[PDB]
Amino acid sequence: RHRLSRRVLLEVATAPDPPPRPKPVKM
Amino acid sequence: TQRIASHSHVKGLGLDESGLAKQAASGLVGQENAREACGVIVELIKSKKMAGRAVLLAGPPGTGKTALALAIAQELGSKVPFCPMVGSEVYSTEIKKTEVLMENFRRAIGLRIKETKEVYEGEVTELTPCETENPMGGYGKTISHVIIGLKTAKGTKQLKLDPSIFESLQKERVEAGDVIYIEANSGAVKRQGRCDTYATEFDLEAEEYVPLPKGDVHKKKEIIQDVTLHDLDVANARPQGGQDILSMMGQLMKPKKTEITDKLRGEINKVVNKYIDQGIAELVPGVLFVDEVHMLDIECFTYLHRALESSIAPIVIFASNRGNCVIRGTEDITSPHGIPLDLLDRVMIIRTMLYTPQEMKQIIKIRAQTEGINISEEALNHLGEIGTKTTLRYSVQLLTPANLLAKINGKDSIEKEHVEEISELFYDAKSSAKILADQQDKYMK
Amino acid sequence: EGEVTELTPCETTISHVIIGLKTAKGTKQLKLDPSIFESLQKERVEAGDVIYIEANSGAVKRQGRCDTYATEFDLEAEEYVPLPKGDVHKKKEIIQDVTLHDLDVANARPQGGQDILSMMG
Amino acid sequence: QRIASHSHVKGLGLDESGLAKQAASGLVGQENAREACGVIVELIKSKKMAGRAVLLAGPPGTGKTALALAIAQELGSKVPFCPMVGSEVYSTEIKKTEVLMENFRRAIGLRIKETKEVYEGEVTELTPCEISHVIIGLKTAKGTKQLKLDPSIFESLQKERVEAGDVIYIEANSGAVKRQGRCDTYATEFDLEAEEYVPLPKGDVHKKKEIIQDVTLHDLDVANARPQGGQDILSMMGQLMKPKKTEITDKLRGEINKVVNKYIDQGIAELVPGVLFVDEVHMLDIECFTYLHRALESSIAPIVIFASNRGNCVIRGTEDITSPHGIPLDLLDRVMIIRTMLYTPQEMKQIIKIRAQTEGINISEEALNHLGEIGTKTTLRYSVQLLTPANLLAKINGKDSIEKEHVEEISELFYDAKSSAKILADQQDKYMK
Amino acid sequence: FVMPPVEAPPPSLHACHPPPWLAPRQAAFQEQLASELWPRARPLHRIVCNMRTQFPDLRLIQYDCGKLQTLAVLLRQLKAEGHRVLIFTQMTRMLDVLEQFLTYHGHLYLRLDGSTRVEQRQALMERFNADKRIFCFILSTRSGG
Amino acid sequence: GPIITYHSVTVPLARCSRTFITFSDDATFEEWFPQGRPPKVPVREVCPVTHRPALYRDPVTDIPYATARAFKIIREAYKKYITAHG
Amino acid sequence: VTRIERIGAHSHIRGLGLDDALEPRQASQGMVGQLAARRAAGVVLEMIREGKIAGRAVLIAGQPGTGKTAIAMGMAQALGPDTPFTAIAGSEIFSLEMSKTEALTQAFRRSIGVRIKEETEIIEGEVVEIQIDRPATGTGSKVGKLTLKTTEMETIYDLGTKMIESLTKDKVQAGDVITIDKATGKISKLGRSFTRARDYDAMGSQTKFVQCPDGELQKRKEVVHTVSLHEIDVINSRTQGFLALFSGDTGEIKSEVREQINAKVAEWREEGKAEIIPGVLFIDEVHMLDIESFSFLNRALESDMAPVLIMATNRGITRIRGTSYQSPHGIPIDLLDRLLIVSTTPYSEKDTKQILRIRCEEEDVEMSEDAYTVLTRIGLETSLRYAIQLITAASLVCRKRKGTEVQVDDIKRVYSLFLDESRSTQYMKEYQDAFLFN
Amino acid sequence: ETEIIEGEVVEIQIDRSKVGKLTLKTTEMETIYDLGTKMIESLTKDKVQAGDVITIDKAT
Amino acid sequence: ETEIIEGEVVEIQIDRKVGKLTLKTTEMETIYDLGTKMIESLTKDKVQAGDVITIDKATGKISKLGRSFFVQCPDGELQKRKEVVHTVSLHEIDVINSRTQGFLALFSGDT
Numbered sequence A: 001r002h003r004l005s006r007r008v009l010l011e012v013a014t015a016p017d018p019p020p021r022p023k024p025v026k027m
Numbered sequence B: 001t002q003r004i005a006s007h008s009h010v011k012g013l014g015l016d017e018s019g020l021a022k023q024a025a026s027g028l029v030g031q032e033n034a035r036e037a038c039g040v041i042v043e044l045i046k047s048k049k050m051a052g053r054a055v056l057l058a059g060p061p062g063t064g065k066t067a068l069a070l071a072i073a074q075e076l077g078s079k080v081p082f083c084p085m086v087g088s089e090v091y092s093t094e095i096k097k098t099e100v101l102m103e104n105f106r107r108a109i110g111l112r113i114k115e116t117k118e119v120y121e122g123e124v125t126e127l128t129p130c131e132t133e134n135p136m137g138g139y140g141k142t143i144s145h146v147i148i149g150l151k152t153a154k155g156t157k158q159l160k161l162d163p164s165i166f167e168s169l170q171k172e173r174v175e176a177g178d179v180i181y182i183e184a185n186s187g188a189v190k191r192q193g194r195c196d197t198y199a200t201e202f203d204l205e206a207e208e209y210v211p212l213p214k215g216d217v218h219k220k221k222e223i224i225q226d227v228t229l230h231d232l233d234v235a236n237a238r239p240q241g242g243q244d245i246l247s248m249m250g251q252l253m254k255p256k257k258t259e260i261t262d263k264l265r266g267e268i269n270k271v272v273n274k275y276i277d278q279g280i281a282e283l284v285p286g287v288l289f290v291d292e293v294h295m296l297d298i299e300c301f302t303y304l305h306r307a308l309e310s311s312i313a314p315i316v317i318f319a320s321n322r323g324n325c326v327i328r329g330t331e332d333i334t335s336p337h338g339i340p341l342d343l344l345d346r347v348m349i350i351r352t353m354l355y356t357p358q359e360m361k362q363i364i365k366i367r368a369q370t371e372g373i374n375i376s377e378e379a380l381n382h383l384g385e386i387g388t389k390t391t392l393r394y395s396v397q398l399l400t401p402a403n404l405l406a407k408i409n410g411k412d413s414i415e416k417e418h419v420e421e422i423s424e425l426f427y428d429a430k431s432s433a434k435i436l437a438d439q440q441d442k443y444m445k
Numbered sequence C: 001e002g003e004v005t006e007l008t009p010c011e012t013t014i015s016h017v018i019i020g021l022k023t024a025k026g027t028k029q030l031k032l033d034p035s036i037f038e039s040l041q042k043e044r045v046e047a048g049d050v051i052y053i054e055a056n057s058g059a060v061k062r063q064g065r066c067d068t069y070a071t072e073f074d075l076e077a078e079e080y081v082p083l084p085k086g087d088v089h090k091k092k093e094i095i096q097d098v099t100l101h102d103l104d105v106a107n108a109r110p111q112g113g114q115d116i117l118s119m120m121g
Numbered sequence D: 001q002r003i004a005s006h007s008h009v010k011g012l013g014l015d016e017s018g019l020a021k022q023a024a025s026g027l028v029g030q031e032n033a034r035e036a037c038g039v040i041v042e043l044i045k046s047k048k049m050a051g052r053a054v055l056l057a058g059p060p061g062t063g064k065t066a067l068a069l070a071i072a073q074e075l076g077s078k079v080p081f082c083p084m085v086g087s088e089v090y091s092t093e094i095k096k097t098e099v100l101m102e103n104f105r106r107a108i109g110l111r112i113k114e115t116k117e118v119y120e121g122e123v124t125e126l127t128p129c130e131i132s133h134v135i136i137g138l139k140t141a142k143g144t145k146q147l148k149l150d151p152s153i154f155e156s157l158q159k160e161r162v163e164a165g166d167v168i169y170i171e172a173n174s175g176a177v178k179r180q181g182r183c184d185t186y187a188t189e190f191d192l193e194a195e196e197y198v199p200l201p202k203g204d205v206h207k208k209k210e211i212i213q214d215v216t217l218h219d220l221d222v223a224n225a226r227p228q229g230g231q232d233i234l235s236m237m238g239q240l241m242k243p244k245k246t247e248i249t250d251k252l253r254g255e256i257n258k259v260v261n262k263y264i265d266q267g268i269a270e271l272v273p274g275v276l277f278v279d280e281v282h283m284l285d286i287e288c289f290t291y292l293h294r295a296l297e298s299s300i301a302p303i304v305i306f307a308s309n310r311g312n313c314v315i316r317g318t319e320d321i322t323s324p325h326g327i328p329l330d331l332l333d334r335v336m337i338i339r340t341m342l343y344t345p346q347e348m349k350q351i352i353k354i355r356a357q358t359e360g361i362n363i364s365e366e367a368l369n370h371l372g373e374i375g376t377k378t379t380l381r382y383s384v385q386l387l388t389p390a391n392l393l394a395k396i397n398g399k400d401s402i403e404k405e406h407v408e409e410i411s412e413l414f415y416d417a418k419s420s421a422k423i424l425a426d427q428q429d430k431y432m433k
Numbered sequence E: 001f002v003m004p005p006v007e008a009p010p011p012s013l014h015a016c017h018p019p020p021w022l023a024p025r026q027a028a029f030q031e032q033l034a035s036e037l038w039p040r041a042r043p044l045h046r047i048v049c050n051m052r053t054q055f056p057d058l059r060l061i062q063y064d065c066g067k068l069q070t071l072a073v074l075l076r077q078l079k080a081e082g083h084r085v086l087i088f089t090q091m092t093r094m095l096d097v098l099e100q101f102l103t104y105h106g107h108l109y110l111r112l113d114g115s116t117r118v119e120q121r122q123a124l125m126e127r128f129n130a131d132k133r134i135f136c137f138i139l140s141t142r143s144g145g
Numbered sequence F: 001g002p003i004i005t006y007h008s009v010t011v012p013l014a015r016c017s018r019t020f021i022t023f024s025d026d027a028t029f030e031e032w033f034p035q036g037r038p039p040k041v042p043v044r045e046v047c048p049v050t051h052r053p054a055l056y057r058d059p060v061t062d063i064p065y066a067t068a069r070a071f072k073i074i075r076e077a078y079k080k081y082i083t084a085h086g
Numbered sequence G: 001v002t003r004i005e006r007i008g009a010h011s012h013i014r015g016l017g018l019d020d021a022l023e024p025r026q027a028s029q030g031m032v033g034q035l036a037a038r039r040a041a042g043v044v045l046e047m048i049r050e051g052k053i054a055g056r057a058v059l060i061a062g063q064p065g066t067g068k069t070a071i072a073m074g075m076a077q078a079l080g081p082d083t084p085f086t087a088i089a090g091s092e093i094f095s096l097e098m099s100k101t102e103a104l105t106q107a108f109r110r111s112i113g114v115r116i117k118e119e120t121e122i123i124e125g126e127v128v129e130i131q132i133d134r135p136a137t138g139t140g141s142k143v144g145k146l147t148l149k150t151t152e153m154e155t156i157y158d159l160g161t162k163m164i165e166s167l168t169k170d171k172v173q174a175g176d177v178i179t180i181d182k183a184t185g186k187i188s189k190l191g192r193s194f195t196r197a198r199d200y201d202a203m204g205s206q207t208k209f210v211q212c213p214d215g216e217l218q219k220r221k222e223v224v225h226t227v228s229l230h231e232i233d234v235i236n237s238r239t240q241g242f243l244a245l246f247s248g249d250t251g252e253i254k255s256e257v258r259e260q261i262n263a264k265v266a267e268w269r270e271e272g273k274a275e276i277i278p279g280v281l282f283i284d285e286v287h288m289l290d291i292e293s294f295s296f297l298n299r300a301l302e303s304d305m306a307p308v309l310i311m312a313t314n315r316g317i318t319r320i321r322g323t324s325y326q327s328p329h330g331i332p333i334d335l336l337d338r339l340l341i342v343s344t345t346p347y348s349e350k351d352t353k354q355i356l357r358i359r360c361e362e363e364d365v366e367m368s369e370d371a372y373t374v375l376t377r378i379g380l381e382t383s384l385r386y387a388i389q390l391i392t393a394a395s396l397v398c399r400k401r402k403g404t405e406v407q408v409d410d411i412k413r414v415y416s417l418f419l420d421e422s423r424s425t426q427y428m429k430e431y432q433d434a435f436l437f438n
Numbered sequence H: 001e002t003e004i005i006e007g008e009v010v011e012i013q014i015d016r017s018k019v020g021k022l023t024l025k026t027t028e029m030e031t032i033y034d035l036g037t038k039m040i041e042s043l044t045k046d047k048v049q050a051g052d053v054i055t056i057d058k059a060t
Numbered sequence I: 001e002t003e004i005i006e007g008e009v010v011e012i013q014i015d016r017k018v019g020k021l022t023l024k025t026t027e028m029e030t031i032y033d034l035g036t037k038m039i040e041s042l043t044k045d046k047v048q049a050g051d052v053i054t055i056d057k058a059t060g061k062i063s064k065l066g067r068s069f070f071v072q073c074p075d076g077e078l079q080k081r082k083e084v085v086h087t088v089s090l091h092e093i094d095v096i097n098s099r100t101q102g103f104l105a106l107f108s109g110d111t
C-alpha cells in the first residue's frame, strides 16, 4: 500500500521545503 | 483427540470387580485370560511395592498386545506415568543404546510434588515505618516495622512487616499505587508493575501498567506438580537459565543428548527421598512399554538384565509377535520370541490367542461405532467373512473407504455392495503376494 | 571511491553524513545515509584515507592511507595506497552467473549480527 | 604402596659383561631374552638410531611385559617410556594413525632450561592508569618496588580481588596472578574477617629462578594445536567449543621440530629420545601396521618395543590373511624378534617365592612345593594368585605362615581355566550359548 | 591441580602487506566478544588458576620437619590448657619459617627479630603484655638485650 | 558518619527475635521513607468534537480527540484562530 | 509411603552371611546355599578390605539363576558405602562419546577413592545479637559486631568487611544457630533456637526449633573429602569438567592428565595428605565385551591403581565377540589365566524352598505350607525366577478375593494366567505359522 | 489478531532518560505519547529518529 | 618486496600521541618520528634501550632477537628493502580463505 512511486518521489524532491512546524499552544 | 486412531475404542480392561474378564466391555472383545493377567499386572503397578518386574505379551500379530498395553494405561490413569517405546528407538546418533533404555526407565518413574504457595497481592496504598519512641543509641530514628497497605478488588489489608524489607522495597522501586506481591515462604517483595487506574490513554508503556488484582489480598493454594526422574536428570545435566559462560554456551550450541552419569542420578534419588520423607512429594512408579522388543540387539537385552534387577526400575511391559527368530546383533542364534532365554527367565509371559469370527465381527462393529459409521447386518457379515480370510486389520480398514463410497453414492449406511466394491479396489497382503508370485519376472529384485 | 578529504556528520542524532572524496579527476561531495556513519567509524575512516563506499549497500572498506601522506611520519605501521585514477563515481554493468546451491548456502547460516549469539556463531 | 603384578621387577639382572644372572632384580629365567633386552637398553641409551622396532614373542606368562618394564627400570625415570595397548588406537575422536603418531611423539622427551620472572610482595598501591593499565607497589622484607603492568594483569588482579595489603605472587612469563592472602600484620585488626593471612615475603620483590622443565614433543604439539597461553577470550572460546582431540598436521610437527632444533642449538635444551611400548600389538589392524611401516622409517621416531603371544593368527582388519604373530610379514621384516621361553618347574618355584616375598607372605617349604606342583599343571599365573587368599586363610586360622592345608583349601575354593573348561564341557546343555 | 606441560599463544598469521581492514576487524570482534563474555567467565577463575600454577601446600612445611610436628603437638596442648608461649630461635630465617607455621596453624604472634627499630621494641612489649589475644611471641635468643 | 544500623536482638516474649533499623540522620530516613501520598486518578478526557472518550492528543493544540474528522475540525478551528488573532 | 528404592530382585540380600572363619551359614542375611561360592566371595571380600594387592580379577561362573548376581550384591552390601563399588553391564562400554578402552578406564578409576583428611577451626553457636552499621550513601567500610552463645560461653566478635558480607548474604538473625569456618568464612545455618516475633506478618508457619550447641565456641573438627580418581580426571581434563561430572560428555581424557594425577596421588600418599581407598568394579555379563576390551583388561589390571575386578557370566564354550574363536565363558584364555573362577552349583529342593521363604518375607507375603511345596515344585520344574514372580502374583490374586494367606488355588491361578518359557514355546510351536519369522 | 500503533515519527524528546515524549503522525492524524523507562530504552536501542515510519505493538 | 628495519635501540621516547625512536647500526645512527600505530606496536611488545630488534615497516611486526652491550648489532644500512619469496600450496590458500582465522586449521586439522 505504501510503496513509493517515481511520481511521488519527484514531486517531493522538486517541491520547496515544508513550512516550519507551528509551536505548541495550550488550547 | 478428535481424530480417531487405531486404539481409540480401548477405554480399559473390561474386568469385573472380581477380576474375571467380561466377554465384551470397555472396547475390548475376547482375550479373557490375557485381560485377567493384565488386570493382575495393573494391581501390581498400583501396589507400588515392586520394582523391575517385567511382563512379556506374546502372540501372533493383530491379537491385542498393544491394545492390552493401552488398556493397562487407561486403567492406571493419567496420574501414573506410561512411557511407550518401540525397540527401534534405541538406535540414536547422539547417545548409546543403554543410555536410551536408562532414560526411558527414568521416564517411567514419576514424582508428584504438593506445596502450598501463600502470597499477598495488592496495590500499595500506604508505606509507613513504625518508629520507636526510644531510639536505640540515643540519636536518629529507629524503626521496628514497616506497614504496607495492600488493596485488591474485594478488600484492603495492612501488613506489619520486618524492617529489613525497606531495602527490598527500594530495590524494587515500590511506591504508592504500584501492584506488588509478597511471598510468605521467602519474605521477598516483587513489583509486578503499576496499577492501570493511574494510566492515561496517552501513555505508551507496555508492561508497566497492570490491572488491580481480583480476589482477596491473601491468596494461598495447593500446587500439585507432576515430574519424572528423567525430567530432573535432564534439567540438571544441561541446565537452562544461568547467566555464566557455560549456560551461554549451552544456549549457543546445538542441544545434544548426553550420557547422564550415575552420580547425578544418585543425587536426584537422594533429593527425591528427602522430599518424600519431608512429605512434599509422593513417588508414582509407572510403566515402561517396549513394543517390538525383538528390534533390540543383544547389547540392549544384556543391559536389561541389570536394568530390571535394580530396586528403582519401573514395571516393564514387553510385546513381541516373533517366533523362533534370530536375535539381532548375533550370528545365527535363535530364541523363541527373538529374546535371549536369559531375559525370558526374568519375565512373565501373557499369551494372546487368535480371534474367532464372532469376536472379529464384534471388533469390527465396535470400530464402526467409534468411527461414526452405520453398517448394515449383511454388510457386517460380509466384512466378517472378509476378515476370516485376509486378516482382522484389513476388515477394520475397509470401514471408512466403504463409508465414503456410500456417501458418494448418496447413502447414510454401508451396504454389502459398498464393501464388495472396496474389496475389489483394495488388495490385502495375501492377494498382493499371489499377484507378485504369479508375475515374479515382471517385478524387480 | 577516493581519498577522504572531509567527514562531517550533520546533527539534527545524525541526519546525514557529508563526505568528501578525491581522485585524480576531481573532488566530489556526497551525502551519506546516517547508517553508513557506523560503518565509517568501525572502519576507522579519517581524512587522508583511501576508501570506497557501495551505493546500494553502504558498505565501507578502508583500503589504506593515501601515499601523499607517506612522509607525515618516519615510521608508522600503515599501508600507503596510490590515489585512485578514475572518477569518484564508478558505474559498471556486469553479468554474473550463480548457481542455486550458492543461494542455498547463503541462506543456511546468518551473516553478521551484533548479538552475542551471532558473534559466537 | 599397593603390590601390582610386576612390583618385584627392578631390572634386567645383568652383570657387567652383559650376561644375565640366573636370579637377579626379580627375574628368574629368560637369560637370552634378558641379554637381548640389555642390548636394546644400550641401543636406547646410545641416542643415535631412530625408529628401531623390537618384537617380544612367546606364549603368555613368559614375562614379555615384565621384560619391557625391566627395560623401563634400567633406563630410569628420566628417559620417557610410553606404555600403550593395541586396543587404544580405536578412538572415537581421532584416527588410529593419529593416535599412533601422538604416542610416537610422547616417547621423545626434552629437558629445557627456563627462567621464571617473579613479582612477589605485599600490595601497597594499586593505581589504574587510563584499556587501563595498572601501577602497583610491592614491598618485601628486603625492599619496595613500583611496577607498571599490562591491563591483562590488572584484570587478573581484579579477578583475584587484590586490594592494598594483600600478599600476591605474579609470574611474569605466564602473566599468572595469585593472591595468597592478607598480610599477617593485619591479622589482629578484627576477630572474624573471613580471610586467610600470609606472612610477608622475605626475599626481594623481583626474583629470577632458573629451572629444568621435562616436556615431550607431543606436549609442544598439543600446546600449539589447542593454544591456551594467550589468556584472551578466543582461547577460552576454543577450549569450551572445541574440547575434543584433533588430527595434528605434519606442518605443526615440522614447526615444532624446527623450534626444538633451534632450542638445542641455543644450548638450553636436551633431547631424550625415549621408548614406546605396545603390549597387545596383534590388536592393531592392517591400517595401523601399514602406517607403522612409514612411522618407523622416520628419522625422528623413538625405539618401539612390540609384544605378542599370538600364534599363526588372522591379522585384524583382513578377511583371512594369516601371519605368524598376528603381524603382517612386512612389519616383521622391520623388527628384531626376542623370543621368550616357557619356564621350568624350578623357575616357577623361584618366581612364586619372589612374589611371596614381594607380597609380604611367609610360605613353608612344603606349601611352596605344593604350589609349584599346582603351577606345573594349570599356569604359573594361577599359582601366584593363590598366595594372598592362602595367606588370608592362614591369618584367619591364627597362623602367620602358609601351610599346605591352606593352599589345598584355596585351590578347592577356586578353579582354574582348565577345570572350568572341563566343567563347561561336562554341562554344555545347562550353560547359555 | 593438573597443569599442561607446555603453554603457548595461538599461531599468528603474518604477511608483509596484509589487507589493512582484516586486523582492525579482528580486533573489534575480539574486543566486543571480550566485553560481552569476560564478566560471565569470572566464576571459573579458580579452576583456571589451579590449572595454571601450583604452589606447595602449607601443610608440607610441618611434614618436612619433625621439630615442627612436635611443636605442633606441644602448642596444641599449651593453647588447650590456656598458656602463652615464647619461641626462641638462633636464626632469623627460622623466625620466618615459624611465622609461616604459626599462621598456618592460626596462632596469632608478634615478632622481635633484632632488626626492629629500638623505639618499636617497647611498643611491641607493651602490646604483648596488654593484648591477651596474642598467643605467641617469637624471639631471637641473642636479640633484645 | 551518616550510617544505617541494622540490629537484631533476642528479647523475651521464652525468647523471641526482633530486628531494628536505625538511621543516623533524618535525611536518610526521609530518603528511604518519603511517605508519599497516594496518587490521583487522571481525568478521563473526552473529545470536544465527537464526545467519545479521548484516544489521541494533537501536539499543536493540546486538544484530545478520537476521530480523524475531529482532528480535521480541530486544525480548521486552529487555523481560523490564527487568522483572526494573528 | 514408598521410597525411591523398592523391593527388587536382590532386595533380600544384606550380606554374604559368613561367620568369623568365613564359613557360610546355611541361611543368613538372605543368602541360602552356595556355600563354596559364598566362602570364596568372602575370601575375595577380605582381600578387598585389606586393600594391598592391585588388579585382582575374579570370575563368578555358573548356570542361569544360580546366584551369581546375588553373591555380587551380597559382597557389595558387606563392603559398605565407605568402599567404592562400581557395578556396570558389559554392554555399557559401547559408547558413541568415547572409546571402549576409555570407558573401561573410567570404570576402573570410578572404583578407586582418594580421601583427604584435614582439621579446621569451627565456630558453632547461637546468635544472640548481630549489629551491622553501614554508610548511608556511597562506597564505605561496613562495621559490625556479632555475639555468639553456647550453653557454657558467650563471646562478642568484631567483624570484618568480608565476614559482614557473608553474614548479610546468609541473612543471619538473632536466634539462628550458625556454623562459621574461620579460614574460608563459609557460614551454614542449621536451625533456629526460638521463634521470631509474632507481631510480624508474612513470616510463614514457624518450624521446629533446634537446641543450642554446648561446649566451647571455637572447636577443632576433622573434615573428610572423598573423591574418586575418575572425578579428579574429569575435573582436571578441562575447565568445564565439573559439569561433565553430571552430564557425562567427558570425551576421551588425555593420558597425560591421568599420569599427572597418578603421580600427584602417589605423592599425597607418601606425604600423608591423602589415603587411597581401593574398591571393586563389577562387570555383569562380561561376555558382551569384545576381544579389544578383553585385551585392554589384560594390561589395565597390571597398574597399582587398578581395583578388584569381579565378572559374572553364564556362558559355556562360546564365540568371543568380535572374533570367530571359541573360548570358555566367552573370554580369551589370556584373560582367564589372570583370574580365579568361582563356580555356582544349582540349588536343591530345600535351598529353593528357603529362597522362596526369604522372598516371601521380603515381600511381606504370607503363604501356606502346601503352597510352599507347590511353588518349590514349580520352581524346580520351571526356574527359580518364575516361582519368585508367582509369589507376588499369587499374593495379588489372594488379596483380590479378600484373603489373608496364599493358598494352592492362588498359585494354580497365577500358573494358569502367567506362562513360563517352556509352555510359551510349546504354545508357539502349536501355532508356529501364526508367528512371523521362524 | 494484534493491536498496533502505526505512524511516522515527528519528534522524540527525552529529558535527563527517565521520561520523554514521542510524537507520531499519519496523513490524517497526529498525537503525542508519554514514554516510560522501557519505551525510551527500546526507542534508543533501535535508534529511532524523526522521519522514521515505525509500528509499535501495544501488548508487548 | 618489503622494507625491513634492523638495528639496536638507543633511545625510545613516548609522550601523551607522539614519540621518537633512535636506532643504530655499527655504521650509522638515526632518530625516527613515530606514528600512532608504530607507537602502539612498540608499547605492546616491551622495547627498551639496548635491544636488537627488526621491524617490518608496513605491519609494525617487531621481533626482539636479543640484547647487545646476546647478539651483535647489525652492521650495514638500518633500513633495507628485501625481496621475500613465499611458496604457498593450494591447500594452504584454501584453508586460509576458508573462514576467518582459518589458517589455524593448517596446524590443528579441523579443516
Ligand SMILES: Nc1ncnc2c1ncn2[C@@H]1O[C@H](COP(=O)(O)OP(=O)(O)O)[C@@H](O)[C@H]1O
Residues within 6 Å of the ligand: B006, B007, B010, B027, B028, B029, B030, B031, B060, B061, B062, B063, B064, B065, B066, B067, B068, B321, B363, B393
Ligand atoms: N480384543 C480386542 N478388542 C478390541 N479391539 C482389539 C482387540 N484386539 C485387537 N484389537 C484392535 O485391532 C487392531 C489390531 O492391533 P493389535 O491387536 O494391537 O496388534 P498387536 O497386538 O500385534 O499390537 C487395533 O486397532 C486393536 O485396538
Ligand SMILES: Nc1ncnc2c1ncn2[C@@H]1O[C@H](COP(=O)(O)OP(=O)(O)O)[C@@H](O)[C@H]1O
Residues within 6 Å of the ligand: D005, D006, D007, D009, D026, D027, D028, D029, D030, D059, D060, D061, D062, D063, D064, D065, D066, D067, D309, D351, D354, D381
Ligand atoms: N622371569 C620372570 N621372573 C619373575 N617374574 C616373572 C618372570 N616372567 C614373568 N613374571 C611375572 O609373572 C607374571 C606374568 O608375566 P607377564 O609379563 O604378564 O607375561 P606376558 O608375556 O603374558 O605379559 C607377571 O606378574 C610377571 O611379573
Ligand SMILES: Nc1ncnc2c1ncn2[C@@H]1O[C@H](COP(=O)(O)OP(=O)(O)O)[C@@H](O)[C@H]1O
Residues within 6 Å of the ligand: G008, G009, G010, G011, G013, G030, G031, G032, G033, G034, G062, G063, G064, G065, G066, G067, G068, G069, G070, G071, G314, G355, G384, G385, G388
Ligand atoms: N543363594 C541365594 N540366596 C538368596 N537369593 C538368591 C540365591 N540365589 C538366587 N537368588 C535370587 O534369585 C534370583 C536369581 O538369582 P540371580 O543371582 O539373579 O541369578 P544369576 O546367577 O543369573 O544372576 C535373584 O532374585 C536372586 O536374588
Ligand SMILES: [Mg+2]
Residues within 6 Å of the ligand: B305, G068, G069, G284, G312
Ligand atoms: Mg545375573
